[PDB]
Amino acid sequence: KLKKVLDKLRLKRKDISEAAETVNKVVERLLRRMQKRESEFKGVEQLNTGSYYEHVKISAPNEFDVMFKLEVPRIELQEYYETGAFYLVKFNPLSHFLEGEVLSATKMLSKFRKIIKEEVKEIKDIDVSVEKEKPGSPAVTLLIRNPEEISVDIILALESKGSWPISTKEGLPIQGWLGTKVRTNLRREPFYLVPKNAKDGNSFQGETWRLSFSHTEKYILNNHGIEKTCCESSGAKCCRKECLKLMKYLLEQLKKEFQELDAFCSYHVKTAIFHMWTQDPQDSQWDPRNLSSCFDKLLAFFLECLRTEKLDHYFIPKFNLFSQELIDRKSKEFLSKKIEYERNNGFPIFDK
Amino acid sequence: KLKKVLDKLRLKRKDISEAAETVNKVVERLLRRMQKRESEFKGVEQLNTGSYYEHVKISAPNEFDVMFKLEVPRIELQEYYETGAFYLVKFSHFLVLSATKMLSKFRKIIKEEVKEIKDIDVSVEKEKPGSPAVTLLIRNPEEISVDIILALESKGSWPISTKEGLPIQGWLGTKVRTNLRREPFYLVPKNAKQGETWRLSFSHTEKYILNNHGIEKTCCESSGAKCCRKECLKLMKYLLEQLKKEFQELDAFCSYHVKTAIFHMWTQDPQDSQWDPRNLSSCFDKLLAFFLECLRTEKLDHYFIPKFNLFSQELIDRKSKEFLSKKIEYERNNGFPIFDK
DNA sequence: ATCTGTACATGTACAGAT
DNA sequence: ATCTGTACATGTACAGAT
DNA sequence: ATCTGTACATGTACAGAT
DNA sequence: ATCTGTACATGTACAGAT
Numbered sequence: 001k002l003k004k005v006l007d008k009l010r011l012k013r014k015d016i017s018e019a020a021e022t023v024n025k026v027v028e029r030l031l032r033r034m035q036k037r038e039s040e041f042k043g044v045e046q047l048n049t050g051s052y053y054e055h056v057k058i059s060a061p062n063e064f065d066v067m068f069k070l071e072v073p074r075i076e077l078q079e080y081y082e083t084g085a086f087y088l089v090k091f092n093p094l095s096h097f098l099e100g101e102v103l104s105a106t107k108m109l110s111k112f113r114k115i116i117k118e119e120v121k122e123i124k125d126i127d128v129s130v131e132k133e134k135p136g137s138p139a140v141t142l143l144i145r146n147p148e149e150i151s152v153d154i155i156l157a158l159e160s161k162g163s164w165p166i167s168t169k170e171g172l173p174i175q176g177w178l179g180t181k182v183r184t185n186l187r188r189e190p191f192y193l194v195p196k197n198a199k200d201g202n203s204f205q206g207e208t209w210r211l212s213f214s215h216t217e218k219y220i221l222n223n224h225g226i227e228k229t230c231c232e233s234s235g236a237k238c239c240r241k242e243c244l245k246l247m248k249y250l251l252e253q254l255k256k257e258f259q260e261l262d263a264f265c266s267y268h269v270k271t272a273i274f275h276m277w278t279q280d281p282q283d284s285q286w287d288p289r290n291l292s293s294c295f296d297k298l299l300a301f302f303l304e305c306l307r308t309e310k311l312d313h314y315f316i317p318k319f320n321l322f323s324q325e326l327i328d329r330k331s332k333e334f335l336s337k338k339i340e341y342e343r344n345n346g347f348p349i350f351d352k
Numbered sequence: 353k354l355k356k357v358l359d360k361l362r363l364k365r366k367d368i369s370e371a372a373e374t375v376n377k378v379v380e381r382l383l384r385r386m387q388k389r390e391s392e393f394k395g396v397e398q399l400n401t402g403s404y405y406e407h408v409k410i411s412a413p414n415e416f417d418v419m420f421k422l423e424v425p426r427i428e429l430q431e432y433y434e435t436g437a438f439y440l441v442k443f444s445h446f447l448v449l450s451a452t453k454m455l456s457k458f459r460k461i462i463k464e465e466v467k468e469i470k471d472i473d474v475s476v477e478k479e480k481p482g483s484p485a486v487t488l489l490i491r492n493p494e495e496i497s498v499d500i501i502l503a504l505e506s507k508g509s510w511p512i513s514t515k516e517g518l519p520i521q522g523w524l525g526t527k528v529r530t531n532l533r534r535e536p537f538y539l540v541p542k543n544a545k546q547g548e549t550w551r552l553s554f555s556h557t558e559k560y561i562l563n564n565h566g567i568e569k570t571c572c573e574s575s576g577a578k579c580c581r582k583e584c585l586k587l588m589k590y591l592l593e594q595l596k597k598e599f600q601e602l603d604a605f606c607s608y609h610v611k612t613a614i615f616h617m618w619t620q621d622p623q624d625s626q627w628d629p630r631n632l633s634s635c636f637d638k639l640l641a642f643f644l645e646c647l648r649t650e651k652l653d654h655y656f657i658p659k660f661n662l663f664s665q666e667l668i669d670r671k672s673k674e675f676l677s678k679k680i681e682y683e684r685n686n687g688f689p690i691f692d693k
Numbered sequence: 694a695t696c697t698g699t700a701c702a703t704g705t706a707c708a709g710a711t
Numbered sequence: 712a713t714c715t716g717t718a719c720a721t722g723t724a725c726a727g728a729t
Numbered sequence: 730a731t732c733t734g735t736a737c738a739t740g741t742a743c744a745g746a747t
Numbered sequence: 748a749t750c751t752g753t754a755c756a757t758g759t760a761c762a763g764a765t
């Protein structure tokens with residue numbers, strides 16, 4: 001039923017290995033070049049993030065997310081107009097990206113990008129170009145034409161080892177689920193800043209960064225139970241990741257047909273399900289035999305977020321991803337009707 | 353009932369503070385002398401172990417265990433007569449690495465430093481053979497002992513005899529196990545019974561387990577449910593201590609026996625709900641039953657070293673074991689009279 | 694001669710394949 | 712049920728540098 | 730290399746509520 | 748009698764500074 005859908009969504013070991021071998025070649029080579037010279041990004045380290053590395057990538061192994069993180073000691077953060085998620089950075093190889101002590105995201109991203117393009121240019125091993133910059137994106141995106149099309153977001157990131165910013169104090173409400181020790185430990189890991197890089201025309205546009213908890217989200221996905229043995233070989237298997245996939249698929253399929261859904265992304269579904277997992281902590285509430293009622297209750301939750309125009313960042317409570325400012329009421333009522341319809345007619349869109 | 357017993361066993365915030373301040377003074381000072389002065393034990397680091405640091409110490413804060421661990425480069429181990437737990441070490445004034453030679457110098461230093469402490473009342477206990485410890489007796493108005501335990505630290509994968517040990521897969525899980533087994537392992541100068549023999553120590557791992565003892569991550573946390581696993585451990589420790597005070601026939605038994613047994617019980621009964629505080633009685637009782645079966649069958653395997661039987665004939669006489677069986681059985685079947693002294 | 698950043702060596706969880 | 716490739720963590724060997 | 734500052738877990742003690 | 752909330756105490760990991 002939904003079992004058969006997940007079978008379709010299941011990646012193939014063969015495709016995984018073909019995609020993985022090529023992607024690793026390129027990434028490895030880019031990462032070397034960032035140190036290989038007296039470059040401003042020497043010391044940058046690699047951290048694989050996103051769905052593929054969380055084992056929730058569906059349909060094909062054709063999008064990979066990688067974080068090129070750089071430790072910046074001695075950092076002063078200033079929150080950008082109470083938004084919660086956006087900051088200026090202040091205070092050395094970075095010398096050339098400063099705006100009198102302020103660190104320009106776009107200056108740094110540009111140099112990062114220029115290097116990447118140069119390195120890609122000198123790869124006649126594999127078929128690979130760099131995608132035209134999209135505004136409001138921190139990524140340098142590689143398009144690889146293995147006989148199959150594969151995208152890789154290379155994401156520049158600052159790494160701070162200090163305590164997380166105050167706006168996250170009330171975030172990550174895992175106490176009743178994964179517990180206090182997991183939370184304290186996670187919050188001792190560093191936090192990450194990535195360029196916002198929009199070209200809206202607003203003040204500080206080019207010097208604004210945004211927080212990233214991709215590393216933490218990865219730990220959670222791969223350690224998702226109240227019982228330590230959830231999904232392990234001497235444990236009981238849950239259906240938490242399976243729900244995540246199914247919901248990801250509903251949004252993808254809808255997004256490929258209807259352009260009224262451009263404002264929506266998978267991060268919305270991931271955020272929503274983090275909330276659901278907090279709300280329903282017990283592994284027994286995600287029993288595989290209850291895949292249907294579980295997926296259904298996730299859908300119901302998501303619709304309520306759309307209806308009430310409210311879906312809080314899981315790490316930054318005050319930052320509403322479903323604000324009027326970010327997504328139109330119309331866009332939200334439109335997605336509400338499409339989800340409601342699919343739900344009440346057997347999920348036609350799963351058969352396409 | 354047994355709730356009332358635990359109250360008696362509960363340490364007092366005041367005594368904890370007084371004992372802790374004095375113990376830390378001494379340990380801090382010993383640790384400095386090992387490093388800040390040019391000794392063979394130059395890079396030695398501190399790691400607190402045992403009941404007090406596991407929060408299972410009963411009655412009084414009067415015995416403290418501390419490990420002075422030393423990072424020692426790539427070493428070769430060779431198993432001492434198949435026991436599983438005892439090894440010779442190989443590859444500087446202690447050379448094959450003699451446990452006794454090393455322990456002696458370690459001890460000499462400690463004695464010298466203790467000698468020049470006019471701050472606090474503190475002597476060094478007469479050496480007990482087949483003990484890895486230098487034991488300090490501190491006469492705060494209250495008597496307090498501190499085992500300073502020399503330990504070699506190896507970063508290599510654990511020895512082959514432990515491959516089948518630490519059977520936590522159905523309890524704490526495979527990820528916890530793999531991770532724990534990536535931590536280093538420790539060799540302690542316990543003389544085996546000879547003089548160049550070390551013994552493995554998993555005090556660091558036992559500490560993680562005591563403080564992360566549930567199948568649910570929230571066991572005993574502030575947004576979790578409280579279990580009675582540590583309470584059973586205390587109760588069983590107390591039964592053994594009280595019995596040991598009365599009967600010399602029980603000199604061969606120690607709390608490590610009880611701790612080992614309960615590790616097995618926790619493995620056998622993984623679910624936090626099987627250690628519900630409302631079931632303190634049935635839980636303690638089933639622990640007793642398990643321990644008697646170990647005594648009856650003369651078998652209690654080291655939790656980390658399966659082939660090493662702590663209840664072998666070679667280590668404890670049949671008579672000693674039948675004697676403890678009768679005493680435990682009696683206490684059990686008459687409401688634990690011994691808990692009222 | 695010693696030291697070291699880099700690459701290899703070892704081990705295992707996760708999940709896909711048989 | 713067993714087997715197998717990938718990703719990821721930690722230990723160690725070593726050519727090139729000091 | 731060593732030390733201090735910070736944050737929070739695991740305790741204990743006790744009052745007021747259930 | 749037990750539970751819940753607060754205060755008070757110790758232990759411990761790690762970052763940033765010296």
Ligand SMILES: Nc1nc2c(ncn2[C@@H]2O[C@H](COP(=O)(O)O[C@@H]3[C@H](O)[C@@H](COP(=O)(O)OP(=O)(O)OP(=O)(O)O)O[C@H]3n3cnc4c(=O)[nH]c(N)nc43)[C@@H](O)[C@H]2O)c(=O)[nH]1
Pocket residue numbers: 049050051052056057058063065134136137264265266267268270
């Ligand atoms: N892969 C992917 N790309 C999408 C999706 N919807 C739109 N896009 C593309 O994103 C570009 C513009 O950026 P955006 O802000 O609209 O989209 C981001 C981000 O790209 C998307 C999720 O992408 P991901 O990080 O690769 O996701 P993951 O690996 O978890 O799953 P999968 O890739 O399999 O879907 O979500 C948006 N987003 C918004 N806020 C955040 C945030 O804080 N973190 C992250 N990680 N993403 C965020 C355009 O090219 C557009 O086409 C989509 O569903 N998937």
Ligand SMILES: Nc1nc2c(ncn2[C@@H]2O[C@H](COP(=O)(O)O[C@@H]3[C@H](O)[C@@H](COP(=O)(O)OP(=O)(O)OP(=O)(O)O)O[C@H]3n3cnc4c(=O)[nH]c(N)nc43)[C@@H](O)[C@H]2O)c(=O)[nH]1
Pocket residue numbers: 401402403404408409410415417480482483499604605606607608609611
């Ligand atoms: N504290 C204590 N001392 C005891 C006990 N029974 C006997 N002793 C004294 O130890 C001397 C040496 O004999 P032993 O080798 O049989 O004793 C050891 C060890 O002393 C004892 C447990 O001591 P601990 O490590 O301080 O205990 P823990 O901190 O877990 O709890 P607590 O101190 O609250 O009881 O058990 C014996 N033992 C045997 N194998 C091991 C092992 O692998 N590890 C450890 N740690 N101990 C082991 C005798 O002369 C006597 O005076 C006793 O119950 N407690």
Ligand SMILES: [Mn+2]
Pocket residue numbers: 050051052063064065
């Ligand atoms: Mn992705």
Ligand SMILES: [Mn+2]
Pocket residue numbers: 050063064065153
């Ligand atoms: Mn992406």
Ligand SMILES: [Mn+2]
Pocket residue numbers: 402403404415416417
């Ligand atoms: Mn002890």
Ligand SMILES: [Mn+2]
Pocket residue numbers: 402415416417499
């Ligand atoms: Mn001791």
Ligand SMILES: [Zn+2]
Pocket residue numbers: 224225230231236237238239240
């Ligand atoms: Zn699971």
Ligand SMILES: [Zn+2]
Pocket residue numbers: 565566571572577578579580581
């Ligand atoms: Zn517990």
